[PDB]
Amino acid sequence: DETTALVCDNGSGLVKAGFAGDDAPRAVFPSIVGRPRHQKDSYVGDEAQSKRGILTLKYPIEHGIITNWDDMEKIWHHTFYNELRVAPEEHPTLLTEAPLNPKANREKMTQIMFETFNVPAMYVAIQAVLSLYASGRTTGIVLDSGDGVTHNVPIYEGYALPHAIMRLDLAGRDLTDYLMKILTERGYSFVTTAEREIVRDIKEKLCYVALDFENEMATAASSSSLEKSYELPDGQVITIGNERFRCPETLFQPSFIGMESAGIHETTYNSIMKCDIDIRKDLYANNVMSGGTTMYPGIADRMQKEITALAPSTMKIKIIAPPERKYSVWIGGSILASLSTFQQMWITKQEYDEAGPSIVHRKC
Amino acid sequence: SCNEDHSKLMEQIRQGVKLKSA
Ligand SMILES: Nc1ncnc2c1ncn2[C@@H]1O[C@H](COP(=O)(O)OP(=O)(O)OP(=O)(O)O)[C@@H](O)[C@H]1O
Ligand SMILES: [Ca+2]
């Protein structure tokens, strides 16, 4: 793969990167950069936490938004030179951004890609949209939930609807936190050295969503139907019960981590209600879920149930949970970038040299 | 894009596509 396009999706927690045309990211590494805590000069990814002990670790991406441009540069460098092993200047590069990304950010990013990395061509696409594309639709409402943030994004004919976007500062990073908390409140000594890592694995291995939380609690109270076990490496085995479904419940009841916000079913419903009454039909029947925090077993049907209850009785609801939705966004991009009707949509270095960083903002 | 070019991109997307397997 040379003279081919690159796809780079920068999550709050995870970076996904690869080549357009590929069915999956060749590179998935933690979105973190570490510099020597005292006085080589920088580390990124797995190696940065491997040596967390002698570095100050930082996260360029907070809430899905880029906040540290220097550190973000180191991430992109590590992406091209160290992960993909490619030269940016001979690959058009597609990049992804959060809904509601400020214009100054998009331009700052376009500006770096050109001046600093000297890529021949580039494009910025909104993450949620790519997810939708990945499913083969151009109309619907996406629920993207990654490590740092959660959005509801209504989309109509390839264009998102900014007035109707719902943002929720609750994602997997805080769900892992919640689980770590509870687990400990039951005598399980957990810290960050290496525990934080285990708590996350338990999360993705054992947690699931209850179709009926009140009802599911009573089950785990009257039998051991729902107990499951996890042997730590130390050796100490531990058992989990209602904790398996109480942790993800936080997505529907944020008041579990004490957030007086509303749950993803409500924000999904509110988001649709915020749209043209004539396209609601299309939206209700096209809930596409993306992100790693949507991977919980049972979340699709819980959502289906919750929404059927909020909406009109006559409307047909539908939830689409691609088994690949952990990587939907990236896949969405992988597809786009490879299509031929898209090849005219690239921003060329030439175009940028004439107009300026502002040559990356279109309406319609 | 904003022209008689956005509709074909759209149509192409829905069409689908294969992706080199790794
Ligand atoms: N099987 C699973 N069950 C539950 N959670 C999971 C699973 N797999 C991954 N996750 C969670 O998904 C999160 C990462 O997902 P993703 O890569 O979509 O987010 P991101 O793009 O890095 O961040 P964001 O989209 O919030 O900016 C992690 O917090 C991880 O715990
Ligand atoms: Ca993301």
Q: Which domains does chain A have, with CATH numbers?
A: 1-127+329-364 (3.30.420.40), 128-169+262-328 (3.30.420.40), 170-261 (3.90.640.10)
Torsion angle (degrees, nearest 10) of CA A183, A187, A188, A190: 90
Number of neighbouring beta carbons within 10 Å of residue B18: 9
Instruction: Sort out which chain A residues have CB atoms less than 8 A from B8's CB and list them.
Output: 341
Alpha carbons A164 and A167: distance in angstroms, whole number: 10
Which position has the token pair 């039998």?
Answer: A223
Cα A86 to ligand 2 centre (Å):
23
- HSE at residue A84, side-chain half, CA atoms within 13 A, is 26
Name the DSSP class of A82. I
- Residue A238 pairs with which residues in a beta bridge? A230
Specify burial of residue A56 (Cβ count, 10 A radius: 0-12, 13-18, 19+). Answer: exposed
Q: How far apart are the first and last CA of chain A?
A: 34
Alpha carbons A335 and A7: distance in angstroms, whole number: 10
The sign of the CA dihedral A108, A111, A117, A119 is: positive
Report how far Cα A232 is from the mean position of its chain's Cα atoms. Answer: 28
- Picking from B2, B12, B20, the nearest residue to A339 by CB comes out as B12
Alpha carbons A175 and A200: distance in angstroms, whole number: 9
Q: What is the resolution of this structure in A?
A: 2.9
Alpha carbons A273 and A214: distance in angstroms, whole number: 27
- Give me the phi and psi of A99, to 5 degrees please: -50, 145
Nearest CA to ligand 1 atom 25: A146
Name the DSSP class of A237. E
DSSP assignment of A325-354: TTSHHHHHHHHHHH-GGGTTSPEEHHHHHH
Which tokens is A289 given? Answer: 């879920």
Is the minimum CB–CB distance between B20 and chain A shorter than 8 Å?
yes
Torsion angle (degrees, nearest 10) of CA A252, A273, A102, A175: 0
Which position has the token pair 């990304």?
Answer: A101
Between the alpha carbon of residue A322 and those of residues A6, A20, A145, A308, the distances in Å are: 23, 20, 14, 20
Q: Is the CB of A172 under 6 A from ligand 1?
A: yes
Atom of ligand 1 nearest to the CA of A248: 4
Yes or no, beta carbons of A331 and B19 under 8 Å apart: yes
Atom of ligand 1 nearest to the CA of A329: 18
Alpha carbons A188 and A202: distance in angstroms, whole number: 13
Cα A151 to ligand 2 centre (Å):
10
Is the minimum CB–CB distance between A342 and chain B shorter than 8 Å?
yes
- Give me the phi and psi of B20, to 5 degrees please: -40, 125
